[PDB]
Amino acid sequence: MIQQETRLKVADNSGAREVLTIKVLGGSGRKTANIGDVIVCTVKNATPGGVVKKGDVVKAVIVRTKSGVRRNDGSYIKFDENACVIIRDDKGPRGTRIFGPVARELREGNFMKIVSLAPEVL
Amino acid sequence: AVPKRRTSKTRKNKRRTHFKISVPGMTECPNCGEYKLSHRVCKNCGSYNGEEV
Amino acid sequence: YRKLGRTSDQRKAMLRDLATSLIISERIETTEARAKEVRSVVEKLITLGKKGDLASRRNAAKTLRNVEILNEDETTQTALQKLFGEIAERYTERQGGYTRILKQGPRRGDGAESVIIELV
Amino acid sequence: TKGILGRKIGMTQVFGENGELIPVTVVEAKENVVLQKKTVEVDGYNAIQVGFEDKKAYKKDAKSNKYANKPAEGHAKKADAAPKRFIREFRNVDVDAYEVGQEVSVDTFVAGDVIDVTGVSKGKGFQGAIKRHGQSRGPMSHGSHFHRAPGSVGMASDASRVFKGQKMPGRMGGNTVTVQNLEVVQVDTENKVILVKGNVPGPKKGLVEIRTSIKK
Amino acid sequence: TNHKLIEAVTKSQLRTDLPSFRPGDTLRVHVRIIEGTRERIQVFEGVVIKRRGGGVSETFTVRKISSGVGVERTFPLHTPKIEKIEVKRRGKVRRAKLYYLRSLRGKAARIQEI
RNA sequence: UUGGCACCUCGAUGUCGGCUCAUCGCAUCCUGGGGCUGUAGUCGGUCCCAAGGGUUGGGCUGUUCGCCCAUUAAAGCGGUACGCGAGCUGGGUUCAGAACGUCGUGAGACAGUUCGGUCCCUAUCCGUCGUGGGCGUAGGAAAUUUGAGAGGAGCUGUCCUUAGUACGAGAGGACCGGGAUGGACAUACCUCUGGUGUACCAGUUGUCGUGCCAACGGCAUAGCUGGGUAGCUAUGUGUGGACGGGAUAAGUGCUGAAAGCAUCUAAGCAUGAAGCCCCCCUCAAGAUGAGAUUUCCCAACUUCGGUUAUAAGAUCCCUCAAAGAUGAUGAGGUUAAUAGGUUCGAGGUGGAAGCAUGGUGACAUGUGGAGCUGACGAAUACUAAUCGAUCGAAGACUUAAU
Ligand SMILES: [Mg+2]
Ligand SMILES: [Mg+2]
Ligand SMILES: [Mg+2]
Ligand SMILES: [Mg+2]
Ligand SMILES: [Mg+2]
Ligand SMILES: [Mg+2]
Ligand SMILES: [Mg+2]
Ligand SMILES: [Mg+2]
Ligand SMILES: [Mg+2]
Ligand SMILES: [Mg+2]
Ligand SMILES: [Mg+2]
Ligand SMILES: [Mg+2]
Ligand SMILES: [Mg+2]
Ligand SMILES: [Mg+2]
Ligand SMILES: [Mg+2]
Ligand SMILES: [Zn+2]
């Protein structure tokens, strides 16, 4: 459950370390986003030397949430953290490596390259 | 807030239409014949349901 | 369960007091709602007494008050001893229903429905 | 188009054919009997009157609704049936397909049927505008003395009145509610139960009416 | 019991091939991934931290550390999506719900074996 | 809007902005339907119909405005005492303090600034939201109902396909049609995920008790902590705005004269919007126009107008909950499972006490998924719903037909 001002870890080597959510995309008055949704965010913390810089306004796909997700079979998955991956306009990642597990819902989201790079897909 | 106009006798008594009490729910005690409250011990003889209390 | 116009601790205390007093006197006058709550407490205490084992006795001790009963023979016994002695022996063959409540009518001071609750 | 009366038993779940979790409501719909048959000729409209859940026979000093009174007993004995707890009309059915006295078994519905379910929603007693009408609270701090109030009820000199339909505190629930386009998940004729997909209005033991969904 | 009718209509959903286990036991849950038409088994190995509910509604939760990130999977105990469950290890715990593990990492989070 | 006037109010008509709650207009921001286009397509421009619904979060500033960030189909303009302070706030502004600049000899002053600075009221009437009683509805009753009216709802994105087709040098790229899946909103509901869960279980500190040990109780926010049943719940789970019909608006026409032609119009016949009337959901016969169907009760006495207690039925009183402020509603009242108890379970907790064993000991292990357990399921008259009482028909007249 990601809303404006929620902070998230970046699960990639794009250069951004922590982002703040500026907007949940996908409709007027949409309050919260979950795994597989795209957000506008600003880079609050970055590694020196990265491609993405502090203060950049970027778009990210949420890949892990503490709230988790429910699946049609009545099972659930929940994570210890809220993580997202900075993306380009074509849903491809800005970085080259993904860190930590990702939910399978990204596949239905068509974030195929993120899914492929992820160390584990759950 | 305060009453803008005093209340006429008519209006007051209309309002008091339903302000009243009822006769108690009472029946004759089968033991001693004195009235009692239904489902209560009879205070006259101390009987209830054919036995002394 | 009723709240009986008291906080949780006060209600617990009052129900223990009433249960003990009903064990002692075998019949007590009280308000209707109090009697309808204390009947359950007292009858569960009767159940413990009828079970009779040490664990039952200690469970009962958690609830009963520490009161001394002076018997007719100048002998004394606690409420817990009375419960696990004469009351339990009395109700050995009765399955529940150890109390009855007899409505008496409203009292003068406040109109409360006075009732008698007694064992048996 | 079909119809039946049951009691809400409760909710549970079943696993579908692909393992999907389907929440279901269990409706016990035993002892449905066609008590009366209404026609345009006599009543001005077509409908079947259905009685549900036998109650006990008339007795002299009955004190509750458990025992049928004489009017109800006569009405039911005309249909040859035992007196019933609930009686409701279905106008959505074809009267010519029913006989007075006929049983209405749960088997009239089949798995996959799309249905409207009608009940009386749970009562909530006297409720305020936030709960009853979903209004916004005032601030809880910053000097506010407005938390759960209903807000302005009109304007000023124009209109010097509160309009009908103003939302205010009052009794909540206990209303007839129809939930449309539910689905019959399962019919168990041995237990006389229907498993309906989703949730339906009313408390447990509450009367529910199941009809073929009006929209199609 | 629960309501007789509920139990009667849900009885045939219950599976009988499930090993006994308790919170604190380490499980390997073989889960059927049916992506498209291909079907495969993915194993989730972790500690049982929670079991709740009854009948067909009963659920359980297994916790794992993946790439340094805790992950919890909750399953309906009788879901047909589980091929099987293997009890890999019996843990020694003192309570039904091991929520305190969510806040522990590393050697602090280890469960003693029976 | 800035003003002009000074007609109501100075024995007081609270004043900016915001919050809560809206309501109306249309001069329409989006969506729907059209004409023209310097409309190839995709986009646009302009005008016409159209008010059903919809019409966002933030930064700055008291601000309204306005600018900016990021969205959206869109981020409409106005009225309602610049709607709404006996509904809230009180940041601005025009009380008393103090200070700067300025003016003034001064006291002081300034639509200059700055820091600080008391927002009362138990609702009588109408009004509005709920909820009862009376009488009426030409006998007295129990159910099921028609629907005159009224209220609700009414929004929309994206993607796939048609089709890389029509159109276009190219770039790009459709109408119409067919599918899928979302946002916001509404409603029901607790199986699931969670919250709460003050008479559920467990751990633990201090201290005071139950003579001591052991085991327990009180108080310390429920002492604190870890869990948690029912109920109530959203952020959770379902469902909805679907499909259509009739009449229309702007329009588009057909046939067609006045006016030998022409012409959508005069007569006549079609077609045509998210709009109108329905369709869908809810209330509804005090609809005094008081409707309908099924069933139940039906005698004596009479000044023979009428009366009567009774009937069917419903209550008082009592046990209650799915209902509830109280009434009311609903489950029951011995020919009884209504509640309590009791017994057995579910779910919850997580291994009681006692004893035994192993340790110097703190503890550990066994007996033993143990002990306990509110609300949830079942069974059982053990307790209490006793004994009683009250209300409640005899069916007006006229005409027509039979
Ligand atoms: Mg205390
Ligand atoms: Mg708010
Ligand atoms: Mg306050
Ligand atoms: Mg005056
Ligand atoms: Mg217009
Ligand atoms: Mg004014
Ligand atoms: Mg104003
Ligand atoms: Mg005012
Ligand atoms: Mg101020
Ligand atoms: Mg000077
Ligand atoms: Mg729930
Ligand atoms: Mg439950
Ligand atoms: Mg003390
Ligand atoms: Mg000690
Ligand atoms: Mg003290
Ligand atoms: Zn007497």
mmCIF file of all heavy atoms in Angstrom, chain F residues 144-157:
data_model
loop_
_atom_site.group_PDB
_atom_site.id
_atom_site.type_symbol
_atom_site.label_atom_id
_atom_site.label_comp_id
_atom_site.label_asym_id
_atom_site.label_seq_id
_atom_site.Cartn_x
_atom_site.Cartn_y
_atom_site.Cartn_z
ATOM 1 P P U F 144 -46.595 -11.340 5.455
ATOM 2 O OP1 U F 144 -45.172 -11.724 5.448
ATOM 3 O OP2 U F 144 -46.981 -9.953 5.774
ATOM 4 O "O5'" U F 144 -47.193 -11.679 4.029
ATOM 5 C "C5'" U F 144 -47.020 -12.962 3.462
ATOM 6 C "C4'" U F 144 -47.753 -13.065 2.160
ATOM 7 O "O4'" U F 144 -49.175 -12.909 2.392
ATOM 8 C "C3'" U F 144 -47.431 -11.991 1.146
ATOM 9 O "O3'" U F 144 -46.232 -12.240 0.438
ATOM 10 C "C2'" U F 144 -48.680 -11.975 0.277
ATOM 11 O "O2'" U F 144 -48.686 -13.067 -0.622
ATOM 12 C "C1'" U F 144 -49.767 -12.215 1.318
ATOM 13 N N1 U F 144 -50.356 -10.959 1.834
ATOM 14 C C2 U F 144 -51.293 -10.311 1.054
ATOM 15 O O2 U F 144 -51.646 -10.728 -0.021
ATOM 16 N N3 U F 144 -51.806 -9.164 1.588
ATOM 17 C C4 U F 144 -51.467 -8.607 2.798
ATOM 18 O O4 U F 144 -52.005 -7.570 3.157
ATOM 19 C C5 U F 144 -50.494 -9.329 3.549
ATOM 20 C C6 U F 144 -49.982 -10.449 3.053
ATOM 21 P P U F 145 -45.478 -11.022 -0.270
ATOM 22 O OP1 U F 145 -44.242 -11.529 -0.898
ATOM 23 O OP2 U F 145 -45.376 -9.933 0.724
ATOM 24 O "O5'" U F 145 -46.492 -10.603 -1.414
ATOM 25 C "C5'" U F 145 -46.605 -9.267 -1.853
ATOM 26 C "C4'" U F 145 -47.970 -9.003 -2.429
ATOM 27 O "O4'" U F 145 -48.951 -8.929 -1.368
ATOM 28 C "C3'" U F 145 -48.106 -7.692 -3.177
ATOM 29 O "O3'" U F 145 -47.694 -7.846 -4.522
ATOM 30 C "C2'" U F 145 -49.583 -7.342 -3.026
ATOM 31 O "O2'" U F 145 -50.363 -7.944 -4.043
ATOM 32 C "C1'" U F 145 -49.943 -7.982 -1.686
ATOM 33 N N1 U F 145 -50.069 -7.014 -0.565
ATOM 34 C C2 U F 145 -51.063 -6.059 -0.628
ATOM 35 O O2 U F 145 -51.800 -5.933 -1.581
ATOM 36 N N3 U F 145 -51.140 -5.218 0.443
ATOM 37 C C4 U F 145 -50.367 -5.247 1.570
ATOM 38 O O4 U F 145 -50.577 -4.421 2.446
ATOM 39 C C5 U F 145 -49.373 -6.271 1.581
ATOM 40 C C6 U F 145 -49.271 -7.105 0.542
ATOM 41 P P U F 146 -46.878 -6.700 -5.284
ATOM 42 O OP1 U F 146 -46.026 -7.358 -6.293
ATOM 43 O OP2 U F 146 -46.269 -5.807 -4.275
ATOM 44 O "O5'" U F 146 -47.992 -5.880 -6.058
ATOM 45 C "C5'" U F 146 -48.858 -6.509 -6.986
ATOM 46 C "C4'" U F 146 -49.898 -5.542 -7.469
ATOM 47 O "O4'" U F 146 -50.815 -5.260 -6.391
ATOM 48 C "C3'" U F 146 -49.365 -4.183 -7.888
ATOM 49 O "O3'" U F 146 -48.948 -4.161 -9.238
ATOM 50 C "C2'" U F 146 -50.521 -3.235 -7.598
ATOM 51 O "O2'" U F 146 -51.438 -3.206 -8.680
ATOM 52 C "C1'" U F 146 -51.203 -3.907 -6.416
ATOM 53 N N1 U F 146 -50.906 -3.321 -5.090
ATOM 54 C C2 U F 146 -51.564 -2.175 -4.680
ATOM 55 O O2 U F 146 -52.326 -1.540 -5.379
ATOM 56 N N3 U F 146 -51.271 -1.772 -3.410
ATOM 57 C C4 U F 146 -50.433 -2.390 -2.520
ATOM 58 O O4 U F 146 -50.279 -1.893 -1.415
ATOM 59 C C5 U F 146 -49.809 -3.580 -2.996
ATOM 60 C C6 U F 146 -50.074 -3.999 -4.233
ATOM 61 P P G F 147 -47.607 -3.397 -9.656
ATOM 62 O OP1 G F 147 -47.410 -3.565 -11.112
ATOM 63 O OP2 G F 147 -46.541 -3.769 -8.700
ATOM 64 O "O5'" G F 147 -47.948 -1.874 -9.378
ATOM 65 C "C5'" G F 147 -49.157 -1.290 -9.847
ATOM 66 C "C4'" G F 147 -49.411 0.022 -9.163
ATOM 67 O "O4'" G F 147 -49.542 -0.200 -7.724
ATOM 68 C "C3'" G F 147 -48.264 1.007 -9.337
ATOM 69 O "O3'" G F 147 -48.737 2.345 -9.391
ATOM 70 C "C2'" G F 147 -47.452 0.791 -8.074
ATOM 71 O "O2'" G F 147 -46.617 1.867 -7.711
ATOM 72 C "C1'" G F 147 -48.550 0.538 -7.047
ATOM 73 N N9 G F 147 -48.050 -0.175 -5.869
ATOM 74 C C8 G F 147 -47.261 -1.289 -5.885
ATOM 75 N N7 G F 147 -46.898 -1.682 -4.707
ATOM 76 C C5 G F 147 -47.467 -0.769 -3.850
ATOM 77 C C6 G F 147 -47.416 -0.692 -2.440
ATOM 78 O O6 G F 147 -46.845 -1.426 -1.641
ATOM 79 N N1 G F 147 -48.128 0.387 -1.964
ATOM 80 C C2 G F 147 -48.806 1.282 -2.740
ATOM 81 N N2 G F 147 -49.429 2.255 -2.077
ATOM 82 N N3 G F 147 -48.861 1.228 -4.055
ATOM 83 C C4 G F 147 -48.185 0.172 -4.546
ATOM 84 P P A F 148 -48.212 3.314 -10.553
ATOM 85 O OP1 A F 148 -48.637 2.751 -11.851
ATOM 86 O OP2 A F 148 -46.784 3.600 -10.318
ATOM 87 O "O5'" A F 148 -49.010 4.660 -10.314
ATOM 88 C "C5'" A F 148 -50.399 4.754 -10.564
ATOM 89 C "C4'" A F 148 -51.008 5.842 -9.724
ATOM 90 O "O4'" A F 148 -51.304 5.341 -8.398
ATOM 91 C "C3'" A F 148 -50.121 7.046 -9.482
ATOM 92 O "O3'" A F 148 -50.146 7.956 -10.563
ATOM 93 C "C2'" A F 148 -50.651 7.611 -8.172
ATOM 94 O "O2'" A F 148 -51.789 8.429 -8.385
ATOM 95 C "C1'" A F 148 -51.077 6.344 -7.436
ATOM 96 N N9 A F 148 -50.056 5.864 -6.487
ATOM 97 C C8 A F 148 -49.210 4.798 -6.625
ATOM 98 N N7 A F 148 -48.422 4.620 -5.607
ATOM 99 C C5 A F 148 -48.767 5.641 -4.740
ATOM 100 C C6 A F 148 -48.290 6.001 -3.473
ATOM 101 N N6 A F 148 -47.327 5.350 -2.839
ATOM 102 N N1 A F 148 -48.848 7.072 -2.881
ATOM 103 C C2 A F 148 -49.816 7.731 -3.523
ATOM 104 N N3 A F 148 -50.353 7.480 -4.709
ATOM 105 C C4 A F 148 -49.773 6.414 -5.271
ATOM 106 P P G F 149 -48.813 8.738 -10.980
ATOM 107 O OP1 G F 149 -49.084 9.568 -12.173
ATOM 108 O OP2 G F 149 -47.717 7.750 -11.036
ATOM 109 O "O5'" G F 149 -48.555 9.702 -9.744
ATOM 110 C "C5'" G F 149 -47.248 9.909 -9.258
ATOM 111 C "C4'" G F 149 -47.220 10.170 -7.778
ATOM 112 O "O4'" G F 149 -47.695 9.001 -7.053
ATOM 113 C "C3'" G F 149 -45.825 10.408 -7.235
ATOM 114 O "O3'" G F 149 -45.398 11.742 -7.414
ATOM 115 C "C2'" G F 149 -45.942 9.962 -5.790
ATOM 116 O "O2'" G F 149 -46.570 10.950 -4.996
ATOM 117 C "C1'" G F 149 -46.873 8.761 -5.935
ATOM 118 N N9 G F 149 -46.120 7.522 -6.210
ATOM 119 C C8 G F 149 -46.158 6.837 -7.389
ATOM 120 N N7 G F 149 -45.404 5.785 -7.404
ATOM 121 C C5 G F 149 -44.823 5.772 -6.154
ATOM 122 C C6 G F 149 -43.899 4.859 -5.598
ATOM 123 O O6 G F 149 -43.421 3.853 -6.122
ATOM 124 N N1 G F 149 -43.559 5.206 -4.300
ATOM 125 C C2 G F 149 -44.039 6.296 -3.630
ATOM 126 N N2 G F 149 -43.596 6.477 -2.386
ATOM 127 N N3 G F 149 -44.897 7.160 -4.144
ATOM 128 C C4 G F 149 -45.248 6.838 -5.400
ATOM 129 P P A F 150 -43.993 12.037 -8.119
ATOM 130 O OP1 A F 150 -43.975 13.472 -8.464
ATOM 131 O OP2 A F 150 -43.781 11.033 -9.181
ATOM 132 O "O5'" A F 150 -42.940 11.752 -6.966
ATOM 133 C "C5'" A F 150 -43.122 12.318 -5.687
ATOM 134 C "C4'" A F 150 -42.274 11.642 -4.649
ATOM 135 O "O4'" A F 150 -42.787 10.313 -4.361
ATOM 136 C "C3'" A F 150 -40.819 11.389 -4.995
ATOM 137 O "O3'" A F 150 -40.019 12.557 -4.936
ATOM 138 C "C2'" A F 150 -40.451 10.330 -3.968
ATOM 139 O "O2'" A F 150 -40.296 10.901 -2.682
ATOM 140 C "C1'" A F 150 -41.720 9.473 -3.973
ATOM 141 N N9 A F 150 -41.603 8.372 -4.944
ATOM 142 C C8 A F 150 -42.171 8.270 -6.180
ATOM 143 N N7 A F 150 -41.836 7.181 -6.809
ATOM 144 C C5 A F 150 -40.980 6.529 -5.936
ATOM 145 C C6 A F 150 -40.274 5.317 -6.009
ATOM 146 N N6 A F 150 -40.328 4.497 -7.052
ATOM 147 N N1 A F 150 -39.511 4.961 -4.959
ATOM 148 C C2 A F 150 -39.462 5.779 -3.914
ATOM 149 N N3 A F 150 -40.075 6.939 -3.725
ATOM 150 C C4 A F 150 -40.824 7.261 -4.787
ATOM 151 P P G F 151 -38.681 12.684 -5.816
ATOM 152 O OP1 G F 151 -38.219 14.082 -5.731
ATOM 153 O OP2 G F 151 -38.939 12.097 -7.134
ATOM 154 O "O5'" G F 151 -37.621 11.774 -5.066
ATOM 155 C "C5'" G F 151 -37.328 11.988 -3.698
ATOM 156 C "C4'" G F 151 -36.526 10.854 -3.127
ATOM 157 O "O4'" G F 151 -37.326 9.640 -3.131
ATOM 158 C "C3'" G F 151 -35.271 10.454 -3.883
ATOM 159 O "O3'" G F 151 -34.169 11.312 -3.650
ATOM 160 C "C2'" G F 151 -35.061 9.029 -3.403
ATOM 161 O "O2'" G F 151 -34.552 9.001 -2.081
ATOM 162 C "C1'" G F 151 -36.498 8.525 -3.372
ATOM 163 N N9 G F 151 -36.863 7.927 -4.664
ATOM 164 C C8 G F 151 -37.644 8.440 -5.665
ATOM 165 N N7 G F 151 -37.734 7.648 -6.692
ATOM 166 C C5 G F 151 -36.950 6.555 -6.350
ATOM 167 C C6 G F 151 -36.647 5.368 -7.050
ATOM 168 O O6 G F 151 -37.030 5.020 -8.161
ATOM 169 N N1 G F 151 -35.818 4.537 -6.322
ATOM 170 C C2 G F 151 -35.330 4.803 -5.076
ATOM 171 N N2 G F 151 -34.533 3.886 -4.527
ATOM 172 N N3 G F 151 -35.596 5.903 -4.409
ATOM 173 C C4 G F 151 -36.403 6.721 -5.103
ATOM 174 P P G F 152 -32.975 11.390 -4.716
ATOM 175 O OP1 G F 152 -31.925 12.272 -4.170
ATOM 176 O OP2 G F 152 -33.573 11.699 -6.028
ATOM 177 O "O5'" G F 152 -32.407 9.907 -4.768
ATOM 178 C "C5'" G F 152 -31.737 9.352 -3.650
ATOM 179 C "C4'" G F 152 -31.271 7.945 -3.914
ATOM 180 O "O4'" G F 152 -32.376 7.126 -4.361
ATOM 181 C "C3'" G F 152 -30.223 7.766 -4.997
ATOM 182 O "O3'" G F 152 -28.917 8.057 -4.543
ATOM 183 C "C2'" G F 152 -30.404 6.310 -5.397
ATOM 184 O "O2'" G F 152 -29.740 5.446 -4.492
ATOM 185 C "C1'" G F 152 -31.905 6.121 -5.229
ATOM 186 N N9 G F 152 -32.645 6.184 -6.501
ATOM 187 C C8 G F 152 -33.511 7.158 -6.915
ATOM 188 N N7 G F 152 -34.031 6.912 -8.077
ATOM 189 C C5 G F 152 -33.481 5.706 -8.455
ATOM 190 C C6 G F 152 -33.671 4.938 -9.627
ATOM 191 O O6 G F 152 -34.393 5.182 -10.593
ATOM 192 N N1 G F 152 -32.920 3.773 -9.612
ATOM 193 C C2 G F 152 -32.086 3.389 -8.596
ATOM 194 N N2 G F 152 -31.440 2.230 -8.761
ATOM 195 N N3 G F 152 -31.905 4.097 -7.494
ATOM 196 C C4 G F 152 -32.630 5.233 -7.490
ATOM 197 P P A F 153 -27.845 8.718 -5.527
ATOM 198 O OP1 A F 153 -26.586 8.910 -4.788
ATOM 199 O OP2 A F 153 -28.486 9.874 -6.173
ATOM 200 O "O5'" A F 153 -27.618 7.622 -6.650
ATOM 201 C "C5'" A F 153 -27.027 6.367 -6.365
ATOM 202 C "C4'" A F 153 -27.113 5.468 -7.567
ATOM 203 O "O4'" A F 153 -28.503 5.194 -7.865
ATOM 204 C "C3'" A F 153 -26.554 6.052 -8.853
ATOM 205 O "O3'" A F 153 -25.156 5.858 -8.949
ATOM 206 C "C2'" A F 153 -27.353 5.342 -9.942
ATOM 207 O "O2'" A F 153 -26.789 4.079 -10.258
ATOM 208 C "C1'" A F 153 -28.700 5.116 -9.259
ATOM 209 N N9 A F 153 -29.746 6.087 -9.638
ATOM 210 C C8 A F 153 -30.258 7.082 -8.861
ATOM 211 N N7 A F 153 -31.205 7.768 -9.424
ATOM 212 C C5 A F 153 -31.353 7.177 -10.652
ATOM 213 C C6 A F 153 -32.215 7.447 -11.727
ATOM 214 N N6 A F 153 -33.122 8.416 -11.739
ATOM 215 N N1 A F 153 -32.106 6.674 -12.812
ATOM 216 C C2 A F 153 -31.199 5.700 -12.808
ATOM 217 N N3 A F 153 -30.341 5.343 -11.867
ATOM 218 C C4 A F 153 -30.471 6.129 -10.793
ATOM 219 P P G F 154 -24.212 6.968 -9.607
ATOM 220 O OP1 G F 154 -22.817 6.494 -9.527
ATOM 221 O OP2 G F 154 -24.593 8.278 -9.050
ATOM 222 O "O5'" G F 154 -24.644 6.961 -11.129
ATOM 223 C "C5'" G F 154 -24.551 5.779 -11.912
ATOM 224 C "C4'" G F 154 -25.186 5.982 -13.258
ATOM 225 O "O4'" G F 154 -26.582 6.333 -13.072
ATOM 226 C "C3'" G F 154 -24.561 7.105 -14.073
ATOM 227 O "O3'" G F 154 -24.534 6.807 -15.464
ATOM 228 C "C2'" G F 154 -25.496 8.272 -13.834
ATOM 229 O "O2'" G F 154 -25.525 9.207 -14.888
ATOM 230 C "C1'" G F 154 -26.845 7.580 -13.670
ATOM 231 N N9 G F 154 -27.737 8.358 -12.814
ATOM 232 C C8 G F 154 -27.565 8.644 -11.488
ATOM 233 N N7 G F 154 -28.495 9.410 -11.013
ATOM 234 C C5 G F 154 -29.320 9.658 -12.097
ATOM 235 C C6 G F 154 -30.495 10.435 -12.193
ATOM 236 O O6 G F 154 -31.056 11.067 -11.293
ATOM 237 N N1 G F 154 -31.012 10.423 -13.479
ATOM 238 C C2 G F 154 -30.465 9.752 -14.542
ATOM 239 N N2 G F 154 -31.096 9.856 -15.719
ATOM 240 N N3 G F 154 -29.369 9.029 -14.460
ATOM 241 C C4 G F 154 -28.865 9.015 -13.216
ATOM 242 P P C F 155 -23.216 6.196 -16.131
ATOM 243 O OP1 C F 155 -23.407 6.244 -17.593
ATOM 244 O OP2 C F 155 -22.931 4.908 -15.473
ATOM 245 O "O5'" C F 155 -22.043 7.216 -15.781
ATOM 246 C "C5'" C F 155 -22.253 8.612 -15.617
ATOM 247 C "C4'" C F 155 -20.954 9.328 -15.350
ATOM 248 O "O4'" C F 155 -20.450 8.998 -14.028
ATOM 249 C "C3'" C F 155 -19.833 8.953 -16.296
ATOM 250 O "O3'" C F 155 -19.916 9.693 -17.493
ATOM 251 C "C2'" C F 155 -18.576 9.196 -15.468
ATOM 252 O "O2'" C F 155 -18.187 10.558 -15.478
ATOM 253 C "C1'" C F 155 -19.053 8.807 -14.068
ATOM 254 N N1 C F 155 -18.785 7.379 -13.777
ATOM 255 C C2 C F 155 -17.510 6.937 -13.415
ATOM 256 O O2 C F 155 -16.599 7.758 -13.315
ATOM 257 N N3 C F 155 -17.315 5.625 -13.178
ATOM 258 C C4 C F 155 -18.324 4.767 -13.297
ATOM 259 N N4 C F 155 -18.097 3.485 -13.055
ATOM 260 C C5 C F 155 -19.624 5.184 -13.667
ATOM 261 C C6 C F 155 -19.805 6.481 -13.897
ATOM 262 P P U F 156 -19.346 9.097 -18.864
ATOM 263 O OP1 U F 156 -19.987 9.790 -20.000
ATOM 264 O OP2 U F 156 -19.415 7.625 -18.833
ATOM 265 O "O5'" U F 156 -17.827 9.522 -18.779
ATOM 266 C "C5'" U F 156 -16.838 8.760 -19.415
ATOM 267 C "C4'" U F 156 -15.646 8.580 -18.531
ATOM 268 O "O4'" U F 156 -16.056 8.121 -17.217
ATOM 269 C "C3'" U F 156 -14.688 7.520 -19.014
ATOM 270 O "O3'" U F 156 -13.860 8.016 -20.044
ATOM 271 C "C2'" U F 156 -13.986 7.095 -17.735
ATOM 272 O "O2'" U F 156 -12.990 8.023 -17.354
ATOM 273 C "C1'" U F 156 -15.140 7.166 -16.731
ATOM 274 N N1 U F 156 -15.844 5.873 -16.597
ATOM 275 C C2 U F 156 -15.127 4.801 -16.123
ATOM 276 O O2 U F 156 -13.964 4.868 -15.809
ATOM 277 N N3 U F 156 -15.826 3.633 -16.038
ATOM 278 C C4 U F 156 -17.138 3.430 -16.365
ATOM 279 O O4 U F 156 -17.610 2.312 -16.226
ATOM 280 C C5 U F 156 -17.821 4.586 -16.848
ATOM 281 C C6 U F 156 -17.166 5.742 -16.938
ATOM 282 P P G F 157 -13.257 7.032 -21.148
ATOM 283 O OP1 G F 157 -13.110 7.806 -22.398
ATOM 284 O OP2 G F 157 -14.043 5.784 -21.173
ATOM 285 O "O5'" G F 157 -11.822 6.707 -20.567
ATOM 286 C "C5'" G F 157 -11.022 7.752 -20.042
ATOM 287 C "C4'" G F 157 -9.800 7.204 -19.376
ATOM 288 O "O4'" G F 157 -10.186 6.404 -18.230
ATOM 289 C "C3'" G F 157 -8.966 6.272 -20.232
ATOM 290 O "O3'" G F 157 -8.075 6.980 -21.073
ATOM 291 C "C2'" G F 157 -8.283 5.390 -19.200
ATOM 292 O "O2'" G F 157 -7.165 6.046 -18.629
ATOM 293 C "C1'" G F 157 -9.371 5.263 -18.138
ATOM 294 N N9 G F 157 -10.236 4.088 -18.345
ATOM 295 C C8 G F 157 -11.542 4.134 -18.744
ATOM 296 N N7 G F 157 -12.086 2.966 -18.849
ATOM 297 C C5 G F 157 -11.083 2.090 -18.490
ATOM 298 C C6 G F 157 -11.099 0.680 -18.408
ATOM 299 O O6 G F 157 -12.028 -0.089 -18.653
ATOM 300 N N1 G F 157 -9.872 0.188 -17.999
ATOM 301 C C2 G F 157 -8.775 0.951 -17.702
ATOM 302 N N2 G F 157 -7.675 0.296 -17.323
ATOM 303 N N3 G F 157 -8.751 2.263 -17.773
ATOM 304 C C4 G F 157 -9.932 2.764 -18.168
#
